[PDB]
Amino acid sequence: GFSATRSTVIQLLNNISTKREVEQYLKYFTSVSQQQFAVIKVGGAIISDNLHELASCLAFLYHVGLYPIVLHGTGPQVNGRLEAQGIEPDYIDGIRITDEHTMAVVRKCFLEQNLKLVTALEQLGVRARPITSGVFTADYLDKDKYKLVGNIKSVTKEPIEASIKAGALPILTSLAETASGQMLNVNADVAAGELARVFEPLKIVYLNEKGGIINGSTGEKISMINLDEEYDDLMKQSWVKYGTKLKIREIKELLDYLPRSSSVAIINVQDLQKELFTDSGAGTMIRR
Amino acid sequence: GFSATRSTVIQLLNNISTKREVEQYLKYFTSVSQQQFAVIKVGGAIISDNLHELASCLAFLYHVGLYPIVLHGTGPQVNGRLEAQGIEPDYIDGIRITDEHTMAVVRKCFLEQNLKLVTALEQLGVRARPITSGVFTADYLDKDKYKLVGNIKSVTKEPIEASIKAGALPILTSLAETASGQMLNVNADVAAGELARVFEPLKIVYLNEKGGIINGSTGEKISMINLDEEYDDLMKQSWVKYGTKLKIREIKELLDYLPRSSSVAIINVQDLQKELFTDSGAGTMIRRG
Amino acid sequence: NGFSATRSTVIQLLNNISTKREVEQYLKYFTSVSQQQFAVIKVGGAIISDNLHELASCLAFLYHVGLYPIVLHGTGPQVNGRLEAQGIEPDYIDGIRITDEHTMAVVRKCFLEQNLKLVTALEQLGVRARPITSGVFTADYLDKDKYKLVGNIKSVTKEPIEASIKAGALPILTSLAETASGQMLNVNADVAAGELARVFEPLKIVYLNEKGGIINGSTGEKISMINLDEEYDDLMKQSWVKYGTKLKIREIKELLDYLPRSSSVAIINVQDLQKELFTDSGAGTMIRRGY
Amino acid sequence: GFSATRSTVIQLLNNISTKREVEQYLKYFTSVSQQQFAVIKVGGAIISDNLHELASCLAFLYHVGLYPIVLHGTGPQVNGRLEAQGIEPDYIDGIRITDEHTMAVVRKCFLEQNLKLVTALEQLGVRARPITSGVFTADYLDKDKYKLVGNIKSVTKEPIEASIKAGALPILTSLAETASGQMLNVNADVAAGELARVFEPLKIVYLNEKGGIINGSTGEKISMINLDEEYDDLMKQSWVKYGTKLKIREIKELLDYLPRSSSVAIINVQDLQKELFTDSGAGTMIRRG
Ligand SMILES: CC(=O)N[C@@H](CCC(=O)O)C(=O)O
Ligand SMILES: CC(=O)N[C@@H](CCC(=O)O)C(=O)O
Ligand SMILES: CC(=O)N[C@@H](CCC(=O)O)C(=O)O
Ligand SMILES: CC(=O)N[C@@H](CCC(=O)O)C(=O)O
Ligand SMILES: NC(=[NH2+])NCCC[C@H](N)C(=O)O
Ligand SMILES: [Cl-]
Ligand SMILES: [Cl-]
Ligand SMILES: [Cl-]
Ligand SMILES: [Cl-]
Ligand SMILES: [Cl-]
């Protein structure tokens, strides 16, 4: 699967002092099966604001023979559509309350974002498959409270494995279905975790536009978190917000389930290579 | 860029031998588009029974730069699965009564058949894209009677057009969605006719194992159906089973909308290349007339 | 060879096909397992300056369907323009350029320019081409006192041409020859192409010019067919058979004396090359022994 | 379209260790101008003695998108051929006296060596263009003394530049032509020096089997020659062989024209990549100082 374009060669010659790190991390990521390298979660905003960088970083991985499983959201675009129509979005515990009309908007938005990412990759000569259904099976998280929102109960691996075996990056929406075919909205961070539990990749990467987790009291970027030692302390800290406290609790539960060779990385999309192919990385890594 | 092997070019030359045929091929080969070449409906049984030949035929089309829109069924596999787990299939008027468990089976079988065909194509060097949702929008056909069965109200073309633009054959299931996201079961003959309605392709082909429609009173294959003359009579004949009635009604409604130059060919896969490259039909040809 | 039909190859192949007969003749070439060289094509030098894209396109078609021609080109007209611009009058006898030291310098520069133009035009269409500018033709002086630096070709070294083809590149040859000790000698491209056809015994022998064959000067009509055994002796006595036309006809007659009766030579415009190679054509001038 | 395999990229990464080296490689890898990366002179003996390693090294360069100008000799093969027909090689001052028959032997050997190297390269997937005339224009050096030997007066750059633009390594012999087309023999060290003068490449590399120049008084390889200081003294030393003297003089005269940042490396093929990718000299390095 390794086939370096001119662009790939140029990117590989970044931070040449780390070239032995680069070759070691390439070798490592390549040693496991093609479906156990990485789950990469993409925030919806990246597809609207930073599509070239997102497509380029995924093309880099593709061209060096790596097949990340790509799972994206679409939240900001949904809020845009709702707003144009005069409708305010509504969340509880960071989860969108999704009635029938809202689900219609969520579906349309997911499909548009999905095809945009797929097409941007194909324009770079990267084979990509839109996987928009048939992967996540769910029941209702809480119908009275969230309406059409899912709690994922099983994952069907076949579409992702087939894509990778055919030489195409699988590009998934985080939309789930009940077994009987009612589509149910699921938060992208949550859907990514479920993929990770089933595929057990070496890496789960959460891409954003803000960077890694920053310490409020000291202002410094948090490079690493050994969760066995630090979790109890970090959650006590009064600087961490509710939105950050929610993400970190579901990361803790994921890494408790996964083996210790798995790890999480929260990074700016433009720091993907630096995070993955150097010792010190770029954003926040989280180990158990 | 596009390239064709010696073997590909030899097979192409074996399929075209008149000025009209060459002109037709080149028109769609070099087409910057809007105009679609073909909608091909694939009977579900063909995926279980004759996959290599189906895949090989479609791969040849791809290797000569043609991009048919492919929609397949899965009815026979659903019946087998239901029967395997000790559940009796349930139909009314040739339409599957699809309760919640049945729909789960339908979805699983559709996905399995879809991936089987896509993967057979990839193995032959054909780029193929599964398209499993986001194309058909539907209302309930009759919720009390058929349960989770749809009546298609519109077709979203973008996924199909995006696949073709990227150089991948679009391989579609016939499942549709309500606007609020309830997936609904739709007979594949009906869904394929709705694709042909909105794309108005040069060729409209239905693949079955019988290679057409057989007249029950005579035991002879029907070569031609002139709908304007024969439709009302044909539909009153007691040998015409519900599945066939569903198909012919859809085709009749389709051909009422399309121009009189359009036709529908119900054929076996062995006659596909001849049906697509020439005007010398095979199997059962249906048109307005 | 490498058969790889691009979009343009497919279009070019099928555009003029309208019968099963035409389909069948293309199939004959594509399914053949013959090891005989497909073609020697002589290119009139003027075509490289006047119709380069079309020339390159036609040669590209052959390359893409795996039927590599051996290409030998001239450069006479642009040499004459160069000499004329320097206030020097071209000097010929019997179709052959009298070539003193200064003229040879001009000839060498023009050959190299035309050669690289053709090679580069092919490369720009994705066709690998190899300039072959020495090491093929070995010659003696034809007549030193009469013609000066002009060669009588004594042998053809095939290896350079065969290596090019084996590597997947069209061999693009100039018609200059060398004495054993390395004095380059000018040779008319019609003659040098004939020497290639003699030694390679190709299936097809085509001479490309702009007028599209040979014109009967008395009647003002393109000659469609020349049967040499019957017509040659009378042909050569005609008033309009002189200069370059006489040299051409004599060369082709001598070539065909050596080759089997099944061989023939077509003198055509490049626009008719595909039709004439593969299908039915009344274009240009066909020359054969006849019987 | 450019692609590189894993092993190619691994070998590239093994050759490049500093940021300076990265930027140097990128400058020539991404070039859209007429700048030249390298002129590499190949001793004739290497083509008979170590062809696979030479071809493999040049193929690596090609596979990382670098297009060195390659000029090779053939002296040892000519000597062998002359000796095979009972003729003693005849030199004066390191320059072959070349009568008509000797020229015929030189021409045939040059063509054979040239096609050997080109073909070795093509077998490794490298596009290579033989360039056997139309580059070097020369007068007679001294006709009474050396006979058919040339003094190069100009280099025509177009054939070499057209080759590189087409994605093919230009593989040159050192034969020259008088304006009126007499081929004249020219020592390959001199011809390669004339190429370096007009192309002003980043790297100037002479490949020989000894991997440099050995000091005869000590038996030790000379690592660095600083010409402004050492040239006059060096050329007086009685161990300095005919051929070596000619080479050192050409290089001295070449370096008088080039900027002081330039140098010439006389090395073995095993040190070629190190010499090209890094500024750590190997073998015998020559510069003005
Ligand atoms: C349940 C829920 O909040 N879903 C998300 C899915 C998109 C995303 O995560 O970006 C939403 O915003 O509707
Ligand atoms: C409603 C209905 O009958 N759907 C079909 C769809 C599959 C097919 O057509 O092959 C079914 O068998 O469930
Ligand atoms: C000897 C002779 O007439 N050579 C030809 C070669 C070029 C050509 O044929 O176009 C000439 O014009 O000099
Ligand atoms: C003039 C002269 O000595 N030429 C060299 C050319 C070959 C080489 O340099 O290897 C010779 O040996 O004839
Ligand atoms: N933020 C960090 N400290 N990252 C360390 C990354 C280490 C290594 N590149 C990896 O991906 O596993
Ligand atoms: Cl938002
Ligand atoms: Cl599904
Ligand atoms: Cl069937
Ligand atoms: Cl004509
Ligand atoms: Cl040597």
CA of D75 to the centre of ligand 10 (A): 9
Q: Where are the alpha helices (DSSP H) in chain D?
A: 6-15, 19-29, 44-49, 51-63, 75-84, 100-123, 143-146, 158-165, 188-199, 227-236, 242-257, 272-277
Residue from D47, D48, D74, D244 to probe ligand 4 pocket by mutation (most atoms less than 8 Å from CB): D74
Q: Which of A2, A5, A22 sits opposite D2 (nearest CB)?
A: A5
D212 touches D220 (CB < 8 A):
no
Determine contact: D10 vs chain A, CB below 8 A.
yes
Does residue A186 have its Cβ closer than 6 Å to ligand 1?
yes
Whole-Å CA distances, D239 to A173, D188, D210, D216, D245: 78, 22, 16, 5, 10
Residue written as tokens 């061209």? A63
Q: Which residues of A touch D25 (CB under 8 A)?
A: 13
Does residue D201 have its Cβ closer than 6 Å to ligand 4?
no
A30 touches A174 (CB < 8 A):
no
CA of C276, nearest ligand number: 9
Q: How was this structure determined?
A: X-ray
Nearest to D215 by CA among D190, D240, D250, D186: D240
Q: 3-state class of D137 per DSSP?
A: strand
Q: Which of B122, B134, B162 sits opposite A119 (nearest CB)?
A: B162
Q: Sign of dihedral through CA atoms A244, A246, A249, A254?
A: negative
Instruction: Answer whether D touches C (≥3 Cβ pairs < 8 Å).
Output: yes
Distance from first CA to last CA of chain C, Å, rounded? Answer: 35
CA of D35 to the centre of ligand 10 (A): 28
For C136-151, give one letter per residue: b (16+ CB within 10 A) or e: bbbbebbeeeebbbbb
How far is residue D227's CA from residue D197's CA, in Å, rounded to a whole number? Answer: 17
Determine contact: D161 vs chain C, CB below 8 A.
no
Å between C123 CA and nearest CA of chain D: 6
CATH tag for C1-291 (out of 3.30.70.260, 3.40.50.720, 1.10.10.10, 3.40.1160.10): 3.40.1160.10
How far is residue D259's CA from residue D6's CA, in Å, rounded to a whole number? Answer: 37
Q: Which of C18, C27, C31 sits opposite B22 (nearest CB)?
A: C18
Q: 3-state class of C194 per DSSP?
A: helix
Å between B120 CA and nearest CA of chain A: 10
How far is residue A197's CA from residue D232's CA, in Å, rounded to a whole number? Answer: 76
CATH tag for A1-288 (out of 3.40.1160.10, 3.30.300.100, 3.40.50.300, 1.20.140.10): 3.40.1160.10
Determine contact: B280 vs chain C, CB below 8 A.
no
Tokens of D253: 């005269």
Q: 3-state class of A35 per DSSP?
A: helix
Determine contact: A111 vs chain B, CB below 8 A.
yes
What are the residue ranges spanned by the domains of chain A?
1-288
Q: Which residues of B touch A131 (CB under 8 A)?
A: 130
C247 touches C93 (CB < 8 A):
no
Which atom, in ligand 2's list, is nearest to the CA of B149? 1
What are the E-state strand segments in chain B? 3-4, 38-42, 69-72, 91-92, 95-96, 128-131, 136-140, 150-155, 169-172, 176-177, 183-184, 203-207, 214-215, 220-221, 224-226, 264-267, 284-287
Measured in degrees and rounded to the nearest 5, phi and psi for residue D39 equal -115, 120
Å between D66 CA and nearest CA of chain A: 12
Burial of residue C175 (CB within 10 Å: 0-12, 13-18, 19+) is buried
How far is residue B217's CA from residue C264's CA, in Å, rounded to a whole number? Answer: 66
Resolution of this entry in Å?
2.1
Nearest to C37 by CA among C285, C168, C205, C272: C205
D98 touches D75 (CB < 8 A):
no
Determine contact: A16 vs chain D, CB below 8 A.
yes
Does residue A73 have its Cβ closer than 6 Å to ligand 1?
yes
CA of A177 to the centre of ligand 1 (A): 14
Å between D5 CA and nearest CA of chain C: 22
Report whether CATH 2.60.34.10 matches the domain B1-289. Answer: no
A131 touches A170 (CB < 8 A):
yes
Nearest to C249 by CA among C271, C231, C262, C276: C231
How far is residue A38's CA from residue A57's CA, in Å, rounded to a whole number? Answer: 13
Q: Whose CA is nearest to atom 11 of ligand 4?
A: D75
Q: Which of D13, D21, D26 sits opposite A23 (nearest CB)?
A: D13
Does residue D120 have its Cβ closer than 6 Å to ligand 4?
no
Determine contact: D180 vs chain C, CB below 8 A.
yes
Q: Whose CA is nearest to atom 6 of ligand 5?
A: A281
B147 - beta bridge partners?
Answer: B98
HSE of C103, CA atoms in CB hemisphere, 13 A = 21
B149 - beta bridge partners?
Answer: B185
Type of residue found at A267: I
Q: Which residues of C touch D177 (CB under 8 A)?
A: 108, 184
Dihedral angle computed from the Cα positions of residues C8, C11, C16 and C22, in that order, rounded to the nearest 10 degrees: 100
HSE of D21, CA atoms in CB hemisphere, 13 A = 20
Does residue D186 have its Cβ closer than 6 Å to ligand 4?
yes
For C93-116, give one letter per residue: b (16+ CB within 10 A) or e: eebbbebeeebbbbbbbbbbbbbb
Pocket lining for ligand 2, CB < 6 angstroms: B 44, 73-75, 78, 95-96, 106, 149, 174, 185-188
Does residue D96 have its Cβ closer than 6 Å to ligand 4?
yes
Q: Whose CA is nearest to atom 4 of ligand 2?
A: B187
Q: Sign of dihedral through CA atoms C46, C51, C55, C60?
A: positive
> B16–C31: do the CB atoms touch at under 8 Å?
no
Q: Where are the alpha helices (DSSP H) in chain C?
A: 7-14, 20-31, 45-50, 52-64, 76-85, 101-124, 144-147, 159-167, 189-200, 228-236, 243-258, 273-278
